[PDB]
Amino acid sequence: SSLHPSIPCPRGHGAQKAALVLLSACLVTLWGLGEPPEHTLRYLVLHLASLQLGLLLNGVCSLAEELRHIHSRYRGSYWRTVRACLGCPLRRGALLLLSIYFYYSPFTWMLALLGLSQALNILLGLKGLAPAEISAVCEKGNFNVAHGLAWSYYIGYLRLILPELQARIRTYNQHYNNLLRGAVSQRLYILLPLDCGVPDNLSMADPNIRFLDKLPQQTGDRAGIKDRVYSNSIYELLENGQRAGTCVLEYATPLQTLFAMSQYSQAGFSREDRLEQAKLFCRTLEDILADAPESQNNCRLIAYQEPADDSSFSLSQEVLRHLRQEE
Amino acid sequence: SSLHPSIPCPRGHGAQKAALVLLSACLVTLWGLGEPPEHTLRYLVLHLASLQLGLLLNGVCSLAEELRHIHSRYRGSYWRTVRACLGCPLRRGALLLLSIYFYYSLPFTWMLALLGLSQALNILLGLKGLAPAEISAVCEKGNFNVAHGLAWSYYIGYLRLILPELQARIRTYNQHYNNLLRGAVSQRLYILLPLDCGVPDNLSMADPNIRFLDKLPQQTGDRAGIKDRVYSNSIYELLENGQRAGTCVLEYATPLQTLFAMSQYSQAGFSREDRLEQAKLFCRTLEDILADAPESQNNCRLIAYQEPADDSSFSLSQEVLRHLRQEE
Amino acid sequence: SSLHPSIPCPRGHGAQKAALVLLSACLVTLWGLGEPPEHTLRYLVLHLASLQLGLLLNGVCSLAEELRHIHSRYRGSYWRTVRACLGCPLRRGALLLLSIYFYYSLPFTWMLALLGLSQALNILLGLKGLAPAEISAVCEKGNFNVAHGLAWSYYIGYLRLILPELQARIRTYNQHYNNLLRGAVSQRLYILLPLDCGVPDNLSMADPNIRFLDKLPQQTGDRAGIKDRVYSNSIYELLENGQRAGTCVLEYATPLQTLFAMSQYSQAGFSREDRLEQAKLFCRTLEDILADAPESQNNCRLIAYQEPADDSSFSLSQEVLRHLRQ
Amino acid sequence: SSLHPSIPCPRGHGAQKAALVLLSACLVTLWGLGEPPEHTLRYLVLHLASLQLGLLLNGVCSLAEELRHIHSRYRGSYWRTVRACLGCPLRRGALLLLSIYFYYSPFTWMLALLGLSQALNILLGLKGLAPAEISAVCEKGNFNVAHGLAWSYYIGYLRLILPELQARIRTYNQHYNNLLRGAVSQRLYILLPLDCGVPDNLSMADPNIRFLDKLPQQTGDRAGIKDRVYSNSIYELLENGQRAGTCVLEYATPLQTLFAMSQYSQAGFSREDRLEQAKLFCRTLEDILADAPESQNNCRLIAYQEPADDSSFSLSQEVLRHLRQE
Amino acid sequence: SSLHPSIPCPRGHGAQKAALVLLSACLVTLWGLGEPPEHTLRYLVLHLASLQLGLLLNGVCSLAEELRHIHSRYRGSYWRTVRACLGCPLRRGALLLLSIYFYYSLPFTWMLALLGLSQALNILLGLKGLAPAEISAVCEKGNFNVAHGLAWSYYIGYLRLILPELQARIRTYNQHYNNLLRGAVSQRLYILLPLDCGVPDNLSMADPNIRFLDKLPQQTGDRAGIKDRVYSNSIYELLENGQRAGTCVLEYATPLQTLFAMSQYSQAGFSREDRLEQAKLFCRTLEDILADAPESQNNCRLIAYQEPADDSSFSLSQEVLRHLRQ
């Protein structure tokens, strides 16, 4: 919500307010018309009971599938299989009895009609979920690709190199770097292009940044591999032909993974998905770094969207703009 | 499916067969009672029309919220918001226009008010939710998993980069530093997939008979603005009853370590059953990806194993050894 | 769409709006006349059910033929043979059961015989065909063209292979082999796409100004069992009013030559009015492919031109120079 | 039909035979039932007329889309648009005029119902085509990717290099080839794997394949490129570690294009379509080469299907067999 | 059409508009009278069925003669010899079944005997013939002329062989052998098409102004097993009012002379008025051939002239010079 105005905000409570207004208008309209309220009570109860019976029939129809994978998904219990499909059995049974008692007061004819309607819905696929209705059920439950990618990035990279970053910078400044050249600042800078176009060579896309030197590497043992290696680099920020400063630059590799996923046919990843996924990845990474012990005191996030008209946009300008708040 | 018996198979068509059986039973029952088919058909029509009019009210209630992020999710268009909330505006408009005519000619404002109350109560109280066994179906159908992203990341970042050059690395190590007195390192890199997500750091633990001998020549590349990214591997040997039996190139799968570590932090919202659910889906997706790649099963294939509950003296040395036997 | 005004735009949603207007008009007309609303519903249901009982007859007539290629197209599956003709055998079965129930209760054997005669006469006399403007939509929605394959072949075989290395050859030539007296050859290899499929072998003809200058260093590779496949290009000069104006790298598009030559052989079955529609579609597909390719328009330029019938003093040099200005 | 049993045969006339059987059964059933034939005639005529009116309404609905492409697709003419959407203005007009005259055998009510049903069919998508009908129309009208690819192959490669192969082989034998080395035979051998998996070099997939030497080049001018070059290769076939013979080997590059089209997502090309097009490309080449002047006397086609169980399939045996019955 | 106004334009759709007008007139006449709508339909159906039953007898009669050439025209297959006469045996069989069903249920053998007798009388007395204006359409739609074959043979044998090589001779002549004092011979090889079939052997006659100048270098090729086939041309001068005005190449068309000679022999059966319509058609066909050939009018020109009957001071020189103006 601060990285870029294009990043969305989490969903709120507009639906409940609209539902309340609709309920109030419906109640006022019912009061305006002349009728006793007992009919309203009876019809409302009957409608709710019919809805419950429809849900139960759908659950029984769906149970014909989940009983083929019992020994693989539900261990070996018939009681967990019915829990996955039919919510919570005890509440469902209580609602069953209440609905049957309130609906029995001809009658067997309507059960057949509900059966036909439910079977038609299952077969012909009349019922379904809108694109903005499955996008709000997988956001509260964390069923995203970018959620996993951001947590992987944090755990595997930033929880590892961030604590020991300043020691390497200090050693490079004293032991190796000469005093005549300018010192490299702290706070590793992460660039997050909200386009997933990550160039392999950073010298491209801007002639004003050139590769200067490297950093001492760090090693560790991870997942049965001895002496994994981590490395970084230092770049030069030319200002109108002369140097203006130095920094430590990186893109975000999961953006490259998203871009490469969007082109293979087997991935099943649309070209409209990997923009919302990039913005969601940026939001989640910012939230994770907000309250981590190795907080933004050691890294800064930069998000930019490439203008279509090329309005004299250069990466170096934005990088210097962000560098100028350090002091 | 063929990797381990515990891995589930994709869902097929069982709900449809149950639906046909229910449809046939309902049709026979309707035929078995005395009632004109005209009523049997017009009641069905009214039922369907009321369902559609309810869906529209739910959609408008959703739009009342979705119209707030207009400059952030839907660019600046009032029409993409409607397309996202209310399906397609032409088929939906036709269904509305046809629904009114049937429901207006066959106390008309009263039923609209009752539908409004029922829909508002559903939205507020929350009676209309999703069972955990259809959220799974839609997520698996549309590829909305954590393991999907993790598996594709693993492939694209590691295997697509190292599998082709493994032959040259092995050959150079063989003719340069490897002596014929010892067993030559076999081909076909081996990957272990513990369906517990418990990945120890060093392979010496958890089995005393796996000991680390030598490294391998490195590979270097440039990625995403980092100069000279390096990759390395290690070579392990298997000891049988005190005697060396062979030599392989062993590796765990790091995304499993990520899946395990994600389940301790409370900010992740990741349970302990979800970890087991995803660990058996990461393997399935990875095998499906490796089946149709040009760097096919001829260079490496997986080894899945589940730790016995009773701990009946499991020895992964035996599993890797028997895979070595079946290789030849 | 942006290359030439003559290139058509993709088909959209106009039939749906016309259908909505017709639906509204017929609904109002039905409301204006006097008839019970139940009769309209019953007749509409019966019509819809006959239109679905009349599709299984066509499906079975087709399945009488599709079962002769079982071992050659459908492995050995009776399930996959009936799945290619009769859509999906579950939704279709349910629709059949409901259709029978509705059409049997609302001389019942008489109507089946008449439906059989009507369907058989449709199949035999051929009254049920397709207009040229519905084939052109069903084969363009699903990518069933010749130009689609030709454009993807062009990309995969040529431009995915020479575009990335185009800088390392121009740069070497310009400094080692190009004399400082001559101007440097400009970047961005230029491709000419004549929407006539008339592709002359040598560029000297059809414009008496462009003249062959020299070649470029070539590159080699191994492909499909042949080793040392050689790619080479050439550099052309543009003489303005008798004097040089610049240099560039010029290419026609060979798939256009293939499209032209296909239209003269008799076994091709490819008409003279088709190799203009396909020529206009090939350019659109190339522009769409190069829009999102990593080896983007920073290395290549497209020039589409249609030769005037009246010879309105058209010269290729003017167009090439006009694009070189940018 | 000879290359491999898995290659399908072109579609025949089973639908017409099934239609005749259905018509005969319907006529016999109508004769068995008791009714005057006048009712049969009246109802059949009415059904056919209703079908014609439905087709006209669908055409008018579709015309609302093709009238915004008039200046691009159909030229400045208003008659070609109608001719494309409808099909035959004079015959259509006669059929409509004759059709509506038979209403004498609540009249606007039926027209309203027909319009409503047709609008529902257009909006709800109830008139789609099954894949085994789209396949039939595509194969009849030559709307395939493989058709274009095969014609491109023949026009661009074989029609250019086939005549000079004998001269190149003879010169290679006389100038360089020794008597101790086996003579390289004629008849360029083309392998057509019906799997689209084309390895970069033949040194893989069969250890018994060893690269021997090259062959003299060929040079020509095409599409403004000066001195395009062509090249081939010579391979040695080993039998149990000993030489058995030599030949001239090649894969089919359009198979590589077909394979690579199916990995990208923008191509919209499935994984069953790949196999179908691969098995159609071979049929089209066999048809083209059957009656060409540079006939099968200079090349041979070898189609092989990789066993699923991997029952020790060695491509060397496959080549050696055709070498034996050369 | 564009060469000379007397060349007829291709036949169009004019009978169909008259058919539409007649259909509308007869329909409104039926509407204006008093008669049941069903009786009109029944009588129309019976008339249509009788007209279809009256063709099977003719087909069987034609087959009774065509069966004697089964070993010479239809290999050995009865299916082909029955398909060559009775259309397609699938639509025809269904039509026959429907016709007999409608004719038998709606004195039955009396009509069969009368139809047979009428058909026998028609075939014997020859009452069913073909108008001269209908044969001229059926034999022009299907390319059943002599001019079509003559034009294609002329093109294939001469124009496809000398036209590309024409410039390489005239360019060399103009420098090596043509004196600078004499004007250079013009390009655009000219062919004269006299619409009279009168082709003199020598060009000196019929115009005392044109005189034979010199030769041209000849070319050699291999055709039809005879080698050293020599093609040579000639150059003529143009004398305007006693002084030289220009030089060009004049050519007649041998097929016109062949058409003229055909009209004289008795075994040819070629009438005097046929060699004029064929002469008209030949020019149109040849112009159509040259329109879309790759070797287009860039090397040739056509001149068509009709000799005036009154000798209105007509001279070939004026026409050829007016052509040389462009």
Ligand SMILES: Nc1nc(=O)c2ncn([C@@H]3O[C@@H]4COP(=O)(O)O[C@H]5[C@@H](O)[C@H](n6cnc7c(N)ncnc76)O[C@@H]5COP(=O)(O)O[C@@H]3[C@@H]4O)c2[nH]1
């Ligand atoms: N700029 C940069 N420099 C690094 O050294 C680095 N190391 C990791 N990363 C990114 O952080 C995350 C942590 O990787 P992890 O181990 O969890 O999964 C990794 C890991 O399973 C495997 N892998 C990648 N590199 C190696 C490697 N050197 N050795 C073994 N396995 C590797 O492939 C997965 C994806 O890697 P990347 O998709 O390129 O981006 C990674 C990843 O998103 C890095 N990013």
Ligand SMILES: Nc1nc(=O)c2ncn([C@@H]3O[C@@H]4COP(=O)(O)O[C@H]5[C@@H](O)[C@H](n6cnc7c(N)ncnc76)O[C@@H]5COP(=O)(O)O[C@@H]3[C@@H]4O)c2[nH]1
């Ligand atoms: N101007 C130009 N210079 C080139 O080097 C070149 N190479 C290819 N192309 C065009 O790009 C596409 C890729 O060719 P591909 O290999 O996929 O199919 C090719 C290939 O199967 C075969 N072929 C062509 N040249 C060779 C060749 N030297 N060796 C073997 N096969 C060849 O014939 C097919 C059609 O070739 P062209 O119909 O002339 O146009 C090609 C083609 O449209 C070129 N265009």
Ligand SMILES: Nc1nc(=O)c2ncn([C@@H]3O[C@@H]4COP(=O)(O)O[C@H]5[C@@H](O)[C@H](n6cnc7c(N)ncnc76)O[C@@H]5COP(=O)(O)O[C@@H]3[C@@H]4O)c2[nH]1
């Ligand atoms: N101006 C001119 N100079 C020529 O050399 C020439 N050669 C042919 N023609 C005309 O073009 C066409 C080519 O005829 P084709 O070869 O198909 O059959 C030829 C061929 O079968 C035979 N014939 C004619 N000349 C020769 C010849 N020198 N050698 C063998 N056969 C010949 O007789 C046929 C008709 O010849 P012409 O009836 O005199 O006019 C021809 C013809 O209309 C020529 N026209």
